[PDB]
RNA sequence: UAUUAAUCUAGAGUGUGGUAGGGAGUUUUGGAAUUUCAUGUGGAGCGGUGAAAUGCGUAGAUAUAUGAAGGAACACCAGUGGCGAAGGCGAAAACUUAGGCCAUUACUGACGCUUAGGCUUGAAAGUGUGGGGAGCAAAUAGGAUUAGAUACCCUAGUAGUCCACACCGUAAACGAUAGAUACUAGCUGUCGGGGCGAUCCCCUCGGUAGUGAAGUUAACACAUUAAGUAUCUCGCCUGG
RNA sequence: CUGCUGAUAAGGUCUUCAAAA
């Protein structure tokens, strides 16, 4: 499993902030990487594929919201995460 | 006649964890005279403890601690 | 399914062997003809329901 | 008009003059029935029996055949209706 | 993680099988914490496996990373001296979080005390235990529950606007319809 | 006033109140509560003025962040309500706009029609008197 | 109502703390039973049926005891049950991994519901390549029954059923009931978390069942897990 | 306690009526 504490402490905009959109999408990207690794390894686990698709869609919706509101933070988040491509 | 003394022993003990090398003689009571897992009506445990006991007893039977078909 | 005669009497041995043979014959006849998985599940549930209702009315 | 001694299991709509009361106690039912009969007997003019009376004349006994048990039992004679195929 | 190995070794001679277990321990278990070992003993196992009737049982209570199992698992079958072996990861057993939970442990100890007291009263030495109250129901409900019962979060609201409040109170349902009998 | 149960409400403010009122009427229930919105507050004010409810009462949390409105129905002595039915017109999606010329008359004037023209919600008769119309929320008779 | 500029937590998520599961994939392991083969004892039948006959058998069958090989499925536990979105999931273990329930003085601050088009999965049968083949058995052969039997019964029996990789994308794929949200009597069980602390039982929050009034229905019936009071969105119907 | 057991040309009456006693 991933070090959620480390990911949150890296992605926090300030202290005690553990549920912002930026920390949520950073956690989502980490889980996306882990699930892509697992799915490429296995290739016949379809529940994991469903979970991966759900997480991808949730990340996309969160990024759409963060682009609609406070777009400068969206540019910041995208250039730190390099998730677009 | 019959009896109403059927209660989950592990519920009263509050054992909360089953290990096959801590109450080995306890599981032999649950096992049938022909080495089968007795149902709830005879065994007396609740569903959670019955499931735990069944898994532990099957693990022991794999480990060759109690037979399969004979006494 | 060993039952000891105990050499004290014989009718007792047959009285227990009748049961042991009955619950043995149940599974012996169950594993005789091939039914689908769903039909086998239906038969198991039907037997369980019959036993449950009999015990409810006898208790 | 219909009056009745409702006992917590009756439909209040059907009865006009509801009398919240017991129906299982042979002393309570006797007391209330005799009270209604006392109303009738006073209207048709004989001496009363229980109404407008002191304790020494209201007192009653408990029929034969610690405290009295107004407990409803014998739920075991309510099996599932004959079904199954 | 926290693992638990149950090793089953051929019953030739106790010191030699102790050496066998020590070698099997020191060979595999790449990354490991302290490896405490027990000795269940020589037992006449139920069914004959590997054409043997007696076997030494050991239990290993080591703990370590997920890679600690592969070499041991692939070497146990190769070793002719080991009949079987079971790596039971206790972190996945049927109830482990409850076992680590501290409050449940103390509660279990209290249950132990009370149940032992009840069983002693039932198996009184020679005087006759009239109640024989073990499987039956208990006495009146627990005053401890009756007192320490939880209180829901009753969120308090402050009145701002009101209109039409008079509190008439019309709690006379099923009132009699007929009033007085009369003649034409 | 203190409460114990959580309070939820539908996203549609007119039909939420209408469903609450209709269910309370059918089940003979007297007091009901819901989340407070200003449209609902005004509509309940006009219902109380027209005499279809006993009282409506708004309340606010201790932190002044949440408001809930609780109202009671007006039952007679024999326990039969004054409301006979409710039907919502301007549902979400299809909003109903009618000028003064087509302002409806509910049940030949026995019931009332709730119209929120320009000065908050407004009864059909007073809307006719003011010669101006607008959004038509619900029919209550 | 829509647009814009902002605030708030009650919808929805995230974090911490409790926690139940046959949820999924990959790799190893185990025991009953059938079959075949090997080795002993034994001597006329075994098998099969409504009744028999094909068939197997003095080249020693059926039976009995021991051993070996290989394949497929995992008794009892097993339920007036659990998990998943559906198909579906039940011998043991490890590794990887998905979702859910309860309590939150924490955080973001409407980020939500539905979803044409698109993508993903989808019982069994079927296809292609390579493996595997114990049992069962479409097609096929024979013996019966029959007026006939290309069927029901029996004896054999190939594909298939099994694994890996690619397709097919249909089912009475059913709760014959799309999803989400708010409200509306009660009674009896059962499963999980939490509160008390022997079990049992009590309370709270949820899952899954039975009975049942208002209410709905053409009737059967549904009935807080609605087919009730209403809203939103999608799909679908218009006589045989 | 389960053998076997297949078929039956076409079209058709029959309610006149309650006004009422
Ligand atoms: Mg079939
Ligand atoms: Mg609004
Ligand atoms: Mg053999
Ligand atoms: Mg297939
Ligand atoms: Mg032929
Ligand atoms: Mg026939
Ligand atoms: Mg055959
Ligand atoms: Mg072919
Ligand atoms: Mg179809
Ligand atoms: Mg199905
Ligand atoms: Mg019903
Ligand atoms: Mg047509
Ligand atoms: Mg014949
Ligand atoms: Mg003909
Ligand atoms: Zn228990």
Curated annotation (Swiss-Prot), chain B:
GO process annotations (BP): translation
Domain of life: Bacteria
Its job: Binds as a heterodimer with protein bS6 to the central domain of the 16S rRNA, where it helps stabilize the platform of the 30S subunit.
Subunit structure: Part of the 30S ribosomal subunit. Forms a tight heterodimer with protein bS6.
Name assigned to this protein: Small ribosomal subunit protein bS18
A molecular function (GO) term: small ribosomal subunit rRNA binding
Keyword set, alphabetical order: Ribonucleoprotein, Ribosomal protein, RNA-binding, rRNA-binding
Record's keyword annotation contains Ribonucleoprotein: yes
Organism per entry: Mycoplasma pneumoniae (strain ATCC 29342 / M129 / Subtype 1) (Mycoplasmoides pneumoniae)
GO CC terms in record: cytosolic small ribosomal subunit
Record-stated family: Belongs to the bacterial ribosomal protein bS18 family.
Claim: Ribosomal protein is one of the keywords in the record: yes
From Swiss-Prot, chain C:
One CC-aspect GO term: ribonucleoprotein complex
GO molecular function, one term: structural constituent of ribosome
Ribonucleoprotein in keyword set: yes
Keywords assigned: Ribonucleoprotein, Ribosomal protein
Gene Ontology biological process terms from the UniProt entry: translation
Family in the record: Belongs to the bacterial ribosomal protein bS21 family.
Protein name as it appears in the record: Small ribosomal subunit protein bS21
Species in which this protein is naturally found: Mycoplasma pneumoniae (strain ATCC 29342 / M129 / Subtype 1) (Mycoplasmoides pneumoniae)
Lineage: Bacteria, Bacillati, Mycoplasmatota, Mycoplasmoidales, Mycoplasmoidaceae
Gene, per the UniProt record: rpsU
Curated annotation (Swiss-Prot), chain D:
Membrane-crossing segments per the record: none
Cysteines joined through disulfide linkages: none
Coiled-coil parts of chain: none
UniProt family annotation: Belongs to the universal ribosomal protein uS2 family.
Protein name, as recorded: Small ribosomal subunit protein uS2
Lineage, top ranks: Bacteria, Bacillati, Mycoplasmatota, Mycoplasmoidales, Mycoplasmoidaceae
Span within the parent record: 197 to 294 of 294
Swiss-Prot record, chain E:
Listed Gene3D superfamilies: 3.30.70.60
Annotated Gene Ontology cellular component terms: ribonucleoprotein complex; ribosome
Keyword Ribosomal protein part of the UniProt annotation: yes
Keywords: Ribonucleoprotein, Ribosomal protein, RNA-binding, rRNA-binding
Signal peptide span: none
Single Gene Ontology BP annotation: translation
Domain of life: Bacteria
Comp. bias (Basic and acidic residues): 144-153
Database matches in PROSITE patterns: RIBOSOMAL_S6
Pfam family, one: Ribosomal_S6
Residue numbers spanned by region Disordered: 121-153
Gene Ontology molecular function: rRNA binding; structural constituent of ribosome
Family (UniProt): Belongs to the bacterial ribosomal protein bS6 family.
Its job: Binds together with bS18 to 16S ribosomal RNA.
Protein name in UniProt: Small ribosomal subunit protein bS6
The organism of origin for this protein: Mycoplasma pneumoniae (strain ATCC 29342 / M129 / Subtype 1)
Lineage of origin: Bacteria, Bacillati, Mycoplasmatota, Mycoplasmoidales, Mycoplasmoidaceae
